[PDB]
Design a protein around this nucleic acid. Sequence first.
RNA 1: UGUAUAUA
Length: 344
Amino acid sequence: DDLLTRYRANPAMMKNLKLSDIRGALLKFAKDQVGSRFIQQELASSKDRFEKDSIFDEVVSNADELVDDIFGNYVVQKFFEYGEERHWARLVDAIIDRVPEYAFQMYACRVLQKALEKINEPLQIKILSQIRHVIHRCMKDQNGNHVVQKAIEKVSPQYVQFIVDTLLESSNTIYEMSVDPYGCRVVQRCLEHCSPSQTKPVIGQIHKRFDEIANNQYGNYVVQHVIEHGSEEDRMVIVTRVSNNLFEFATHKYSSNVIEKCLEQGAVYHKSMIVGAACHHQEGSVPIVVQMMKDQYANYVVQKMFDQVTSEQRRELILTVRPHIPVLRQFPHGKHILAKLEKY
RNA sequence: UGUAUAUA
């Protein structure tokens, strides 16, 4: 008979198990799927604040074994959730040596994010100082990107300055990160949480390779974030570049959502640019918008246009489209959205 | 009719 074995077989014990009852058996309970679930329930439900201190020192001394365990990491997280600063400082001091490794570990990175989510700034910088040694590799790792995201999300901009320095360290880093499946999220968090003096260099690097980023499966989300969290001059430059090349940007899988973001977030003169190019620029002897309506992707942009655009700019679209309606009805995407646009 | 977002 063993306390863990007895609890798994009969959780509803005659004397209901508390955390102080598993004293000396923390590691066995924490590494068990059912046992860890018990600690999570009591750490979240027990009104006796002193009950969690009976196992806490066992959690600290075995933190190097629990933070990267398939079940033990939930126990460590709950002490950041329901513990206080005295609990945080001891947990951080216990895991700080292998933070350069925990950031890349599937379960251990969850603990690091929860810590940055809950703890105070001095303890946040403690974890942040250990990320400095692996920041470049950590930024585009399958697990480490979520650690870098939470740091940008939860600590002051002047403390993530070394991350912005890493993104600008080389001429191509911003592009590589923008087209990376994990690194593109670090660029996104920076675009909405960093200071203007940090975002302005990064945004300027996005404009240096705007065309390659805008049609990238991940970089298009980066361009969309510059549209939403950028300055007035940033949307202007973006809306001019997409309007200068509307057809190719609307007829491609990923860059088509960029023009929808321009239409969703743009001012009147921004949409006037998009409408003017769609109506008055040609794609094979016929207006851009007419060829857009028979395209598999650009028809969504025409839908987005007609719904987000001024009624007067909508009249310019209607007059441009009307004489081409018999031509469009012969195309499957043309007849499809002509039906959804029969409203006009 | 068309895009990313991780643990039992």
